[PDB]
Write a protein that holds these residues in place. Structure first.
Motif, PDB file in Angstrom:
ATOM      1  N   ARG A   1      -5.689  -3.759 -10.031  1.00  0.00           N
ATOM      2  CA  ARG A   1      -5.636  -4.090 -11.728  1.00  0.00           C
ATOM      3  C   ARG A   1      -5.338  -5.735 -12.048  1.00  0.00           C
ATOM      4  NH1 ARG A   1      -1.358  -0.200 -13.782  1.00  0.00           N
ATOM      5  NH2 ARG A   1      -0.143  -1.060 -12.011  1.00  0.00           N
ATOM      6  N   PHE A   2      -4.434  -6.053 -11.054  1.00  0.00           N
ATOM      7  CA  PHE A   2      -3.855  -7.371 -11.087  1.00  0.00           C
ATOM      8  C   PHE A   2      -4.797  -8.757 -10.623  1.00  0.00           C
ATOM      9  CE2 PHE A   2      -0.470  -4.454 -10.443  1.00  0.00           C
ATOM     10  CZ  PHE A   2       0.121  -4.554 -11.503  1.00  0.00           C
ATOM     11  N   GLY A   3      -6.067  -8.280 -10.087  1.00  0.00           N
ATOM     12  CA  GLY A   3      -6.908  -9.115  -9.670  1.00  0.00           C
ATOM     13  C   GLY A   3      -6.203  -9.939  -8.270  1.00  0.00           C
ATOM     14  N   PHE A   4      -5.436  -9.437  -7.392  1.00  0.00           N
ATOM     15  CA  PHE A   4      -4.985 -10.182  -6.316  1.00  0.00           C
ATOM     16  C   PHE A   4      -5.931 -10.189  -5.319  1.00  0.00           C
ATOM     17  CE2 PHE A   4      -0.446  -8.759  -7.920  1.00  0.00           C
ATOM     18  CZ  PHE A   4      -0.456  -9.990  -8.657  1.00  0.00           C
ATOM     19  N   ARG A   5      -5.842 -11.297  -4.250  1.00  0.00           N
ATOM     20  CA  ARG A   5      -6.711 -11.471  -3.198  1.00  0.00           C
ATOM     21  C   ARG A   5      -5.880 -10.577  -2.023  1.00  0.00           C
ATOM     22  NH1 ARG A   5      -9.898 -15.915  -3.044  1.00  0.00           N
ATOM     23  NH2 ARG A   5     -11.274 -14.587  -1.705  1.00  0.00           N
ATOM     24  N   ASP A   6      -6.502  -9.765  -1.491  1.00  0.00           N
ATOM     25  CA  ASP A   6      -6.021  -8.871  -0.461  1.00  0.00           C
ATOM     26  C   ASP A   6      -4.485  -8.252  -1.084  1.00  0.00           C
ATOM     27  OD1 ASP A   6      -7.689 -11.058   0.652  1.00  0.00           O
ATOM     28  OD2 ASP A   6      -7.557  -9.882   2.407  1.00  0.00           O
ATOM     29  N   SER A   7      -4.743  -7.777  -2.178  1.00  0.00           N
ATOM     30  CA  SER A   7      -3.349  -7.101  -2.662  1.00  0.00           C
ATOM     31  C   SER A   7      -2.186  -6.366  -1.633  1.00  0.00           C
ATOM     32  CB  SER A   7      -3.501  -6.450  -3.905  1.00  0.00           C
ATOM     33  OG  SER A   7      -2.517  -5.637  -4.306  1.00  0.00           O
TER      34      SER A   7
END
Lengths: 50, 50
Positions: free
Chosen positions: A1-7
């Motif tokens: 949901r937060f658009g993190f790279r390799d969350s």
């Protein structure tokens, strides 16, 4: 949901991965393990600690 | 020896003496442990991580 790279976050820790339940090891058992190099190859969940 | 000596004393032959012809009875074997062995000078510590 937060658009993190390799969350690093998951909604909940997976119950099964690739059709099999993820191994769970308590921290005290993990601390005394001498075959840790073989265990971390598959992946596990550390619990019984904060 | 035959005239001047009066009395003589005899004892059983000591086992220390060995004739030269019987030199092979003095051959014996000794075993020295291997030089690859290392002898430990450090104590063993007992511990646990619960």
């Amino acid at each position: 949901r937060f658009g993190f790279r390799d969350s690093p976050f998951c909604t909940s820790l997976p119950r099964t991965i690739m059709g099999n339940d993820v191994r769970r090891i308590s921290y005290n058992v993990f601390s005394m393990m001498e075959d840790i190099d073989d265990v971390i190859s598959e992946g596990f969940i550390l619990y019984d600690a904060y | 020896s035959k005239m001047n000596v009066s009395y003589r004393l005899y004892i059983k032959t000591p086992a220390c003496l060995l004739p030269l012809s019987d030199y092979m009875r003095a051959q014996h074997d000794y075993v020295s442990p291997s030089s690859s062995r290392v002898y430990i000078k450090d104590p063993a510590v007992v511990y646990t991580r619960s």
